[PDB]
Amino acid sequence: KDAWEIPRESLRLEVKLGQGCFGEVWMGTWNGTTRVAIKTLKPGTMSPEAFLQEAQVMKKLRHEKLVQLYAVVSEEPIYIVTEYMSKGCLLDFLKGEMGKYLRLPQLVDMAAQIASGMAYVERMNYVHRDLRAANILVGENLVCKVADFGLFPIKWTAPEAALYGRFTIKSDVWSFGILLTELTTKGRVPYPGMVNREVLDQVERGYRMPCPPECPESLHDLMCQCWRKDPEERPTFEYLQAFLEDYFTSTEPQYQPGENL
Ligand SMILES: CN1CCN(CCC(=O)Nc2ccc3ncnc(Nc4ccc(NC(=O)Nc5cc(C(C)(C)C)nn5-c5cccc(N)c5)cc4)c3c2)CC1
To answer: So what's the architecture of 1-84 in CATH?
Structure first.
């Protein structure tokens, strides 16, 4: 009934990318030419209206650094069609064969992109609630886009959010700080060696992750600003974007490439 609808013959489902509890994820082709990602709803598992809220949100939030909705099939069996990002989630990308080649100039640039996407979320007064590398999609030429696989993650979650349910754009900023450690460690789990119960407490006592090996101190300092006890004292995404884009001229103009970063 809307301009997003497509015939069912428009979609070729080519390669299965993952199975969930409510359906599947496929790489495929829309209109014989456009490479596409296809999200499946297994009937009976979830309200059609519930599954289609994903598309409704993706219609309202459009930006070059947010995952793009292409089309829907809104009658059961339902299909949600989005743009195909050829490198998968950032986490897998960072951990995989491409890990070793990425250095700080690339990693900061990816950060700048994510920040930009999140700066749009900021302008829209939306909250992500689960920003981290597993929810970032990577495409050609290191293009990064904010996304949500919808599939707890206290290690990435701001204390006030984890404890008191206070999820804001500022608990997103905290998460972005943790995202920065994922970028600088090539995808390792944050707070290595600590279980979930060890993180929540120590963070409340004021523990913050130390500067990762080879990371410039100015970048760790930026993480620390994202990790301030007081949500309102955390920097805006607009600020994070600008800082990251200008990093190699204004902040670290003497940066020398090392072993890993
Ligand atoms: C060891 N491996 C083994 C297998 N690997 C996984 C394999 C894999 O999956 N590959 C792959 C490769 C290329 C892919 N290319 C594209 N998409 C993929 N998927 C993809 C499809 C759709 C979406 N949807 C959204 O992002 N939605 C969305 C955006 C947003 C905003 C606007 C950000 C807020 N909000 N919501 C939103 C709103 C409401 C409800 C919900 N639930 C969400 C996300 C990702 C791909 C997936 C993992 C570990």
So the answer is: 2-Layer Sandwich (3.30)
Residues of the chain with CATH 1.10.510.10: 85-254
What are the catalytic residues? 130
Q: What would the two tokens of residue 114 be?
A: 């994510």
Resolution reached, in Å? 2.7
In this structure, the residues whose C-beta lies within 6 A of any atom of ligand 1 are 17-18, 25, 37, 39, 53-54, 57-58, 61, 66-67, 82, 84-85, 88-89, 92, 128, 137, 146-150
Residue of the CA atom closest to atom 36 of ligand 1: 148
One-letter amino acid identity for 22? F
Residue 150 burial (10 A CB sphere; 0-12, 13-18, 19+): exposed
Distances (CA, A) of 196 to 79, 126, 154, 228: 36, 27, 7, 20
- At the top level of CATH, the class of 85-254 is mainly alpha
